[PDB]
Ligand binder design. Structure first.
Ligand SMILES: [Mg+2]
Ligand SMILES: [Mg+2]
Ligand SMILES: [Mg+2]
Ligand SMILES: [Mg+2]
Ligand SMILES: [Mg+2]
Ligand SMILES: [Mg+2]
Ligand SMILES: [Mg+2]
Ligand SMILES: [Mg+2]
Ligand SMILES: [Mg+2]
Ligand SMILES: [Mg+2]
Ligand SMILES: [Mg+2]
Ligand SMILES: [Mg+2]
Ligand SMILES: [Mg+2]
Ligand SMILES: [Mg+2]
Ligand SMILES: [Mg+2]
Ligand SMILES: [Mg+2]
Ligand SMILES: [Mg+2]
Ligand SMILES: [Mg+2]
Ligand SMILES: [Mg+2]
Ligand SMILES: [Mg+2]
Ligand SMILES: [Mg+2]
Ligand SMILES: [Mg+2]
Ligand SMILES: [Mg+2]
Ligand SMILES: [Mg+2]
Ligand SMILES: [Mg+2]
Ligand SMILES: [Mg+2]
Ligand SMILES: [Mg+2]
Ligand SMILES: [Mg+2]
Ligand SMILES: [Mg+2]
Ligand SMILES: [Mg+2]
Ligand SMILES: [Mg+2]
Ligand SMILES: [Mg+2]
Ligand SMILES: [Zn+2]
Lengths: 123, 69, 83, 23, 181
RNA sequence: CGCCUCCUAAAAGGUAACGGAGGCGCCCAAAGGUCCCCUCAGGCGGGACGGAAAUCCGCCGGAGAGCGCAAGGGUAGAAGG
RNA sequence: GGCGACACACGUGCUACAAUGCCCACUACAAAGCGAUGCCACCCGGCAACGGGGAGCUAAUCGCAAAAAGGUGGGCCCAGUUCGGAUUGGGGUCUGCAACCCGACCCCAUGAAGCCGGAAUCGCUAGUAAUCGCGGAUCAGCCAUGCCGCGGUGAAUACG
């Protein structure tokens, strides 16, 4: 487990590799490398352990990441449910939270179609 | 101990990123580690990292008491 | 969300009901049609009856729910499910 | 892609500007 | 025998403190480590890859001690288990090799644990022994991502001469066991 | 319809009925000889995946486990591993 | 308050599954329209949505304005990826009396299904189809991927 808790992929560039960490999008990648002064274009295989620890030390202390971030995200959702606002209610039943229609679609939140019998027609 | 089946434990030095150095015994002579006891947030004081937040919310919100009196 | 350049919004006609209460010694049930009002630190410990479109829903207010609107705690539709 | 707001092409599609598409 | 940092710490730092905390009248009354027992519950190797010498060799790397196999005591239909199948590895660490393993465990292994925030204060035997379970074996310094086929976890038994939970806790705490509460 | 086990069977043995209940017509090159070593089931507590039950640790636990297959007898001071 | 519901089912579409592609920088070539509590040059603050300033134009003059695919340079190297951009956490902006139900944006983080789609079925005969961007009407704002239009690039095939 190199950094933060994860092993970022060798043979790809640092700026891309950092993104594989939960909590680092491409934007935080560019800024971290700038702030610690490492080339964004250097393959992970080709970093001095000096570069490794410098990049490592920065990233973990600057932002909350991986598990801790997930936990903090979890506490937020948990809070909404417990109070419990309409937003919290939506998380209970696993419906969309941001005002999307549910007559159709919503498959990402609702999941696979549970097909059901319809209404029969006359003969 | 039984001959032939066990791996030799030798004097070994484990090195952390925080510059910590540990004198111990291992199957490997030298080992480099990302973290150790000496620098791990839970171990070191209470080095609360990025999260001082607790948590904050909700009525640290303030900003302000502007709605009139 | 509402631009913070502008002020945090409450209807005032509901806030004054609360503030008059704070003086005389609370509480009293408060009937309101202001779902659109923000929950405000002076409202904690009260119970405000938000009207969902059909009924006045009693809502007790605590610190953990300060930043929200009152209507957020009085859902407008009833579901239960299908079949 | 056009549905990616976090890109030039995406901001063009939505007809808006920002960090990812400046004016 | 040899000098190991954690062992010395037990004799000069931990032993006097324990007498202070509990007031033993006999030099043997005071808590000791008896043995540390490590177990890879396995059985993922019951039928498929019917032999995982890989787990043994990698366990051998960490402890310096080659584990012995444990075989099923009875056949169990639901676990797809025939009596006598090789379904575990166990190694018993005593004396120096116990100290050395505990030393690296406290110094580097536990810190490597994912989202680690201390051990469980409640995992005490009731009879003054302790157990903890690991889910990854790469947590140990002499095991790396490159050398591993699949993640294997383990069970660790630390056995003390202490009669009670209270005495054993102080020992493990004084030795450097980090507890969440 | 021959053979094994229990009861009937009246505290030696034996004892009948189209009396009450089961089992056998095999098996094992180790499941045989000997030497050496080892001790169960179960219960509570502890432990990643792991469950009522896999493997690990501790305490209690004289035999209630096991001994290829019915039943009975025997049996860990072993016939069990 | 609801018309915005959601175990489900259908139509019409949008965005894709990638290298004849994706990205960043740099550099070109349209047309038709719209515009006085309107379009807003340019300056500065903000990573930014925007905000404060602040000229010009009652407009073949001033502005919306950059057209985009393209062209040039470099990066990515076949990966559920620098493909895809749904979903969700957080923080902001603007219109508006007011964005809880139920607005559009911007930013950090998240990065789902999807590897070209069963039976079946649609459109188009040339500046057409495909593909690329632009404008308007409605309109405070906007759920427009809709509609009506405008140009850019530009095929394949018709035996019968
Ligand atoms: Mg990331
Ligand atoms: Mg809806
Ligand atoms: Mg030795
Ligand atoms: Mg007040
Ligand atoms: Mg993208
Ligand atoms: Mg003493
Ligand atoms: Mg306990
Ligand atoms: Mg003990
Ligand atoms: Mg390691
Ligand atoms: Mg008799
Ligand atoms: Mg006789
Ligand atoms: Mg036999
Ligand atoms: Mg023998
Ligand atoms: Mg148990
Ligand atoms: Mg497993
Ligand atoms: Mg028995
Ligand atoms: Mg039988
Ligand atoms: Mg309608
Ligand atoms: Mg559409
Ligand atoms: Mg208009
Ligand atoms: Mg994926
Ligand atoms: Mg998939
Ligand atoms: Mg991606
Ligand atoms: Mg949000
Ligand atoms: Mg709204
Ligand atoms: Mg492919
Ligand atoms: Mg395609
Ligand atoms: Mg025709
Ligand atoms: Mg396209
Ligand atoms: Mg348009
Ligand atoms: Mg409009
Ligand atoms: Mg919408
Ligand atoms: Zn360290």
């Amino acid at each position: 487990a190199r950094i933060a808790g994860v092993e970022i992929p060798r043979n790809k560039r640092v700026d891309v590799a950092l993104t594989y960490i939960y909590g680092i999008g491409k934007a935080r990648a560019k800024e971290a490398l700038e702030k610690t002064g490492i080339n964004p274009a250097t393959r992970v295989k080709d970093l001095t352990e000096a570069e490794v620890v410098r990049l490592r030390e920065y990233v973990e202390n600057t932002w909350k990441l991986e598990g801790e971030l997930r936990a903090e995200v979890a506490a937020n959702i948990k809070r909404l449910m417990d109070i419990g606002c309409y937003r919290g209610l939506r998380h209970r039943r696993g419906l969309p939270v941001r005002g999307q229609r549910t007559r159709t679609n919503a498959r990402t939140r609702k999941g696979p179609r549970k097909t059901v019998a319809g209404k029969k027609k006359a003969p | 101990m039984k001959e032939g089946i066990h791996p030799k434990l030798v004097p070994a030095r484990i090195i952390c990123g925080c510059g910590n150095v540990i004198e111990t015994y291992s199957t490997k002579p030298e080992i480099y580690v990302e973290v150790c006891s000496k620098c791990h947030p839970f171990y070191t004081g209470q080095q609360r990292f990025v999260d001082t937040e607790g948590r904050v919310e909700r009525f640290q919100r303030r900003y302000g008491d502007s709605y009139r009196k | 969300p509402r631009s913070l350049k502008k002020g945090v919004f409450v209807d005032d006609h509901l806030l004054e009901k609360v503030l008059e209460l704070n003086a005389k010694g609370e509480k009293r049930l408060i009937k309101t049609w202001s779902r659109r009002s923000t929950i405000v630190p002076e409202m904690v410990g009260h119970t405000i009856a938000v009207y969902n479109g059909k009924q006045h829903v009693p809502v007790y207010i605590t610190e953990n729910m300060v930043g929200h609107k009152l209507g957020e705690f009085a859902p407008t539709r009833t579901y239960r499910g299908h079949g | 892609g056009k549905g990616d707001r976090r890109t030039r092409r995406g901001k063009i599609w939505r007809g808006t500007y920002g960090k990812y598409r400046p004016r | 025998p040899l000098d190991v940092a954690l062992k010395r710490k037990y004799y000069e730092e931990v032993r006097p403190e324990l007498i202070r905390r509990f007031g033993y009248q006999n030099v043997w009354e005071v808590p000791r480590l008896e043995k540390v027992v490590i177990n890879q519950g396995l059985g993922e190797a019951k039928e498929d890859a019917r032999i995982l010498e890989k787990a043994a060799q990698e366990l051998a790397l960490i402890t310096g001690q080659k584990p012995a196999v444990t075989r099923a005591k009875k056949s169990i239909s639901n676990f797809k288990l025939r009596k006598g199948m090789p379904i575990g590895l166990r190694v018993t660490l005593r004396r120096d090799r116990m100290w050395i393993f505990l030393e690296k465990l406290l110094n580097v292994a536990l810190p490597r644990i994912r989202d680690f925030r201390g051990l469980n204060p409640n995992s005490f035997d009731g009879r003054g022994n302790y157990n903890l379970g690991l889910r990854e074996q790469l947590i140990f310094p002499e095991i790396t991502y490159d050398m591993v086929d699949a993640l294997r976890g383990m069970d660790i038994a630390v056995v003390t001469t202490a009669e009670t939970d209270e005495e054993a806790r102080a020992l493990l705490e004084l030795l450097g066991f980090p507890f969440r509460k």
